[PDB]
Design a protein around this ligand. Structure first.
Ligand code: SF4
Ligand SMILES: [Zn+2]
Ligand SMILES: [Zn+2]
Lengths: 98, 149, 714, 155, 37, 22, 18
């Protein structure tokens, strides 16, 4: 939400994105994340989660529903590889406009 | 134990299950606290019903239903009659035919007078005492021992 | 996807299936080929289900003259609802593969509680209430009153079904309960009675085990027409306990009090009848003298003349005599005693009630109750139970015992004595299924060694094969923790079970595991007392606070509503970032009812070997009978039931969709050579010395590694 | 040994080496004070399961041993006695005895009361004789204790 | 402060009780004790 | 004794209900 | 219930082979 309150005012031509480095699988929340997820899809904010030693449900749905990807650190090389992969520009979705 | 008790002394029954109710021909719940008064006057007369008792006629029973008490007492007596075994009858109806009137007699005797019942019992006793009662007594006592064993 | 099965090429919908499915199908085929029953085990639900349906359908299409119908039974309606949808999917594929429709019909049956559409009973939610009203709505007097066309609330769906629904049988298709209700609504026909009728013109029928174990419902569905049909159990690992439980009956102080109130209601009804007219009811007396439904099986029940009970007064008197004797025998203050023959002999000696008339107690009761035009059986139920018990105990007791307990169960002592007619064998009770049907297949998961079953149930297994999951990755990871990090044995010995260190080791283990395991985790305890004691000990310590702080925690109770809400909140907590922990008793109803899936019970913790209190009279009677009659050792069967129940509660973590799960056992007992052999083959083969005697720390480390290895795609 | 007692690998090794078979082997075990030498001694007694005598170099040690025995073993306080001039527990009344080299090894005249216990100690045979801080044992007086007390195995 | 505030924000009973029984001429640690005692 | 479980589960229930805005 | 030491020494070195 703090990111969305910032990225919502961004122009439409720019790819709005968020990279989440998730460490502790438990995370407190003041409201149902599904509404926020639906809002992220509507806000066209690409969200991709990277989980460290955790395969979380909310991160799974958040990524795949938003179109982003959720990955988990297999080892240091996997972590290096995943961040290196995220450096690539995002491939345009059929829902994305120029 | 759960029931209140005798129409007069309905208090010790709640205290313990060791005290048991007594049954009588009158089908009336009685116990020592009440029974002691029945000996000082009348010497064997039901308190509310007034019916006389030939002797003490007290027996231990643990049933709250006085109808069952009477019915069991009546049952036990009637079982001495009509109790011939199944081999006596070839037809399926006969196996339970007499049991119908027997159960009617037993049930009706709990409420109605035994005038016709005793007459019928006597009229059949005159016939059944000859052979079938003699034979069924053996078979009944034998099968009763088999039930015990 | 054509499968080169041993007997024939089998069409299958999915382009890819795992190797073990071919084995399971070609192995199961042996039961068909050999024309005989058998037993086998397979972890996956959906895989074994779809492969079973494909195999049996192809076999039925190949040999319709040999097998007329397929009877499938599963744990519960929610599972049955999914299975029948999988059959529809298979039929949709088959129709697409064939390119044309075929004369095939399959349907799922259910009780009137769910399978009903009448507006007057729709607001009712208790099964006995819906059944009682439905019975009343369908009753001959209501039907007659309906035929009189007087103002009457009647089941139009029944009248239209009896008139038209009976006249035209449904041609083909698959009808799920929700679809069957909609169909019934659209057609204006009773779904229950329509489904029951459709059994006469259907190839596949689906219902739970009690629809086959309880003779009243089972007889109507297991008619002699199915003399050459196949019956299959998919998850009846506890078929013995369910069968015995379905045969066992419990009587109590309040039950007798309700029976007495019912008896007074019957008397008032008899008076109302006698003051109105009894001669019309004596039309039944003719057929009775000539000579809900009883739980007595086909070979035990007979239409023999009821004996001396020839009138309502005789029956009511006979019932009074028995009720007084039962109350007397129940209210007796003494130690718990078993009187299998002595109760009946005592009944004959104490109140002179012979077994012969008593045998017809339920038969006469239903006849009398029917002629009495009673409102509904819902309130009379205790009296019907007493009458059922009375005829049952008087008919046969070879596989039963009478137990008298001065107090209610689940309590140390209460002034509410109870009596049990505890059953003790499944073989004689299930005997009609194996005797009538040409083949019986005992399929299940978490199934303890198969060779015990031919002892508890009389069967000659054609198949004795235990299958194990075949996958590119080890989707399941069983592990046994035998030692605490405090260098102490973690065994749940009866004297050691209460040890604060073992309790602390479980709390530390759960604290660490709940912190490292993502989403939903579940832990099973041996009993509520130990669970509460454990939780209380963890509450006195920081353990419970650290756990709750790390992740939300929920605990199950005997209350279905509270546990349902807690479980829904636990699941909803797992959906959100909060996550949740569920603590439950292995024997609890929630464990036998809940299904674990990805992120919903991702890891299952078992604290100790689940052994029931060995002083319980039920266990005593059951265990001694198995040793006396079936010769199974006390510790052998007691361990088998503990191993089975543990695997059942713990193995549910794997159900389908190829989702990973963890199974950690916190007791070195499970690692013992015998316990390992009693453990199911798929668990036993995935289990290994590296994870056979892990320390609490080692378990957390191996779990964390396994989770990292499972998160990537296959 | 009550399950509250935790045994470390080095402790287990030393005990396994001392109990190489069903017969206890006599000898010396060297363990730091922080390594729980007291627990090993208590464990050895629990292993031997026979009447044993513990001797400390000081009354403070005797107190420490009593606490450790109660702390680690199922034995009750009455079953343990601290045969000492400063304190009395009626040693003859119980099986486990605790004392010091200064008391048993005493070269001068014994008090009449202490003589009663000592004669009982002399006549009884000790299954296990635990000696703490044995570096003092080679002393001319302390070594006499080994000739005074009759013990099957001495640790 | 966070102890009472987290409880007050989380539980309805404390939320209502603290609004009506707000600390006056007393120490907040007493209110904490009244809850956990 | 059961109140501890009831309260702990009420707490987790209220934390979840608080985490669900109307 | 006998203790773990009744069996014998650990002989850890015997696991090595050439
Ligand atoms: S007759 Fe049919 S619609 Fe009416 S109550 Fe029974 S099941 Fe429901
Ligand atoms: Zn009278
Ligand atoms: Zn009186």
């Amino acid at each position: 939400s703090i990111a969305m309150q910032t990225l919502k005012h961004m122009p439409g031509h720019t790819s709005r994105e968020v990279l989440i480095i998730f460490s502790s699988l438990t995370t407190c929340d003041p409201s149902n994340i599904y509404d926020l997820i639906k809002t992220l899809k509507a806000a066209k904010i690409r969200v991709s989660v990277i989980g460290l030693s955790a395969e979380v449900r909310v991160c799974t749905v958040l990524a795949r529903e938003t179109g982003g990807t959720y990955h988990v650190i297999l080892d240091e090389s996997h972590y290096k590889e995943l961040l290196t992969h995220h450096v690539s520009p995002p491939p345009a979705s059929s829902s994305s406009e120029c | 134990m759960d029931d209140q008790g005798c129409p007069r002394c309905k208090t010790t029954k709640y205290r313990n299950p060791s005290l048991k109710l007594m049954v009588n021909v009158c089908g009336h719940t009685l116990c020592e606290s009440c029974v002691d008064l029945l000996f000082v006057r009348g010497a064997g007369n039901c308190p509310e019903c007034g019916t006389p008792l030939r002797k003490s006629n007290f027996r231990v029973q643990l049933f709250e239903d006085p109808t069952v008490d009477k019915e069991v007492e009546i049952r036990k007596k009637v079982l001495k009659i009509y109790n011939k075994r199944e081999e006596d009858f070839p037809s399926l109806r006969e196996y339970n035919d007499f049991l119908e009137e027997v159960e009617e007699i037993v049930f009706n005797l709990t409420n109605n007078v035994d005038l016709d019942n005793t007459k019928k019992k006597m009229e059949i006793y005159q016939k059944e005492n000859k052979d079938v009662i003699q034979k069924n007594k053996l078979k009944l006592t034998r099968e009763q021992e088999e039930l015990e064993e | 996807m054509k499968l080169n099965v041993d007997g024939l090429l089998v069409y299958f919908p999915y382009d890819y299936i795992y190797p073990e499915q071919f084995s399971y199908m070609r192995e199961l085929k042996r039961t068909l080929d050999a024309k005989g029953h058998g037993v086998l085990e397979m972890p996956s639900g959906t895989g074994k289900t779809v492969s079973l349906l494909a195999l049996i359908m192809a076999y039925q299409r190949a040999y319709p003259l040999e097998v007329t119908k397929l009877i499938y039974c599963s744990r519960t309606v929610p599972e049955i609802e999914k299975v029948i949808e999988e059959l529809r999917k298979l039929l949709n594929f088959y129709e697409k593969q064939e390119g044309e429709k075929l004369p095939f019909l399959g349907l799922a049956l259910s009780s009137r509680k769910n399978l009903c559409i009448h507006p007057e009973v729709t607001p009712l939610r208790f099964g006995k209430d819906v059944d009682g009203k439905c019975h009343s709505l369908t009753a001959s007097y209501v039907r007659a009153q309906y035929q009189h066309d007087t103002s009457l609330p009647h089941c139009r769906f029944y009248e239209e079904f009896d008139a038209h629904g009976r006249e035209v049988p449904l041609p083909a298709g698959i009808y799920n309960l929700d679809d069957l209700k909609a169909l019934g609504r659209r057609q204006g026909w009773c779904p229950y009675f329509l489904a029951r009728y459709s059994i006469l013109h259907a190839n596949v029928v689906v219902y739970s085990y009690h629809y086959l174990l309880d003779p009243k419902i089972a007889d109507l569905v297991s008619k002699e027409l199915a003399r050459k049909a196949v019956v299959v159990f998919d998850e009846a690992h506890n078929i013995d306990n369910v069968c015995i439980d379905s045969m066992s009956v419990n009587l109590t102080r309040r039950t007798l009090d309700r029976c007495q109130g019912n008896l007074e209601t019957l008397q008032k009804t008899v008076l109302r009848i006698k003051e109105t007219d009894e001669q019309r009811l004596r039309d039944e007396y003719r057929r009775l003298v000539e000579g809900a439904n009883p739980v007595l099986p086909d070979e035990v029940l007979q239409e023999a003349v009821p004996g001396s009970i020839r009138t309502a007064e005789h029956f009511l008197g006979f019932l009074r005599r028995l009720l007084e004797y039962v109350k007397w025998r129940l209210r007796v203050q003494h130690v718990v005693q078993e009187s299998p023959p002595a109760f009946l002999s005592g009944l004959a000696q104490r109140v002179c009630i012979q077994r012969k008339p008593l045998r017809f107690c339920a038969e006469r009761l239903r006849s009398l109750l029917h002629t009495l035009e009673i409102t509904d059986l819902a309130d009379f139920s205790p009296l019907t139970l007493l009458a059922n018990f009375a005829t049952l105990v008087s008919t046969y007791a070879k596989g039963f015992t009478i137990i008298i307990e001065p107090f209610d169960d689940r309590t140390p002592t209460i002034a509410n004595p109870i009596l049990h007619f505890s059953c003790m064998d499944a073989s004689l009770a299930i005997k009609p299924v194996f005797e009538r049907f040409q083949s019986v297949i005992i399929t299940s998961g978490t199934l303890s060694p198969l060779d015990i079953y031919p002892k508890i149930l009389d069967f000659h297994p054609v198949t004795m094969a235990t299958f194990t999951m075949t996958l590119a990755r080890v989707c399941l990871c069983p592990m046994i923790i035998g030692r605490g990090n405090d260098q102490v044995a973690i065994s749940s010995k009866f004297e050691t079970r209460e040890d604060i260190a073992v309790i602390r080791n479980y709390g530390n283990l759960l604290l660490e595991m709940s912190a490292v395991v993502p989403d939903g985790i579940v832990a099973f305890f041996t009993s509520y007392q130990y669970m509460e004691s454990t939780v209380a000990s963890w509450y006195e310590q920081g353990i419970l606070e650290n756990i709750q702080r790390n992740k939300l925690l929920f605990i199950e109770t005997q209350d279905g509503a509270e546990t349902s809400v807690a479980l829904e909140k636990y699941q909803e907590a797992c959906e959100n970032g909060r996550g949740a922990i569920l603590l439950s008793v292995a024997r609890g109803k929630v464990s036998e009812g809940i299904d674990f899936v990805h992120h919903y019970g991702r890891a299952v913790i078992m604290f100790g070997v689940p052994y029931v209190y060995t002083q319980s009279r039920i266990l005593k009677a059951r265990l001694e009978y198995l040793r006396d009659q079936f010769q199974i050792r006390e510790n052998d069967f007691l361990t088998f039931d503990a191993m089975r129940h543990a695997a059942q509660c713990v193995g549910r973590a794997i159900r389908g969709k190829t989702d990973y799960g963890l199974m950690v056992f916190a007791d070195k007992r499970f690692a013992r050579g015998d316990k390992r052999g009693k453990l199911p083959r798929w668990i036993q083969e995935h289990l290994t010395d590296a994870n056979l005697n892990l320390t609490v720390d080692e378990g957390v480390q191996v779990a964390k590694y396994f989770l990292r290895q499972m998160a990537q795609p296959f | 040994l009550k399950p509250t007692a935790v045994l470390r690998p080095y402790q287990e090794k030393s005990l396994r080496k001392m109990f190489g078979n069903g017969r206890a082997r006599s000898g010396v075990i060297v363990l730091p004070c922080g390594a729980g030498k007291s627990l090993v001694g208590v464990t050895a007694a629990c292993t031997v399961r026979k009447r044993c005598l513990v001797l400390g170099n000081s009354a403070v040690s005797v107190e420490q041993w009593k606490a450790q025995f109660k702390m680690w073993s199922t034995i009750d306080d009455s079953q343990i006695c601290r045969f000492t001039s400063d304190a009395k527990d009626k040693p003859i009344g119980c099986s486990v005895a605790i004392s010091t080299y200064s008391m048993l090894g005493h070269t001068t005249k014994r008090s009449w009361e202490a003589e009663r216990v000592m004669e009982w100690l002399k006549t009884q045979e000790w299954g296990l004789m635990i000696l703490d801080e044995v570096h003092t044992i080679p002393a001319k007086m302390f070594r006499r204790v080994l000739t005074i007390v009759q013990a099957h195995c001495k640790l | 402060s966070d102890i009472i505030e987290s409880i007050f924000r989380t539980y309805p009973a404390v939320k209502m009780k603290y609004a009506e029984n707000v600390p006056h001429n007393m120490t907040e640690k007493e209110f904490w004790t009244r809850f956990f005692q | 004794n059961a109140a501890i479980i009831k309260r702990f589960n009420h707490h987790s229930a209220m934390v979840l209900a608080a985490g669900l805005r109307k | 219930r006998t203790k773990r030491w009744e069996g014998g020494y650990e002989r850890t070195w015997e696991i090595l082979k050439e």
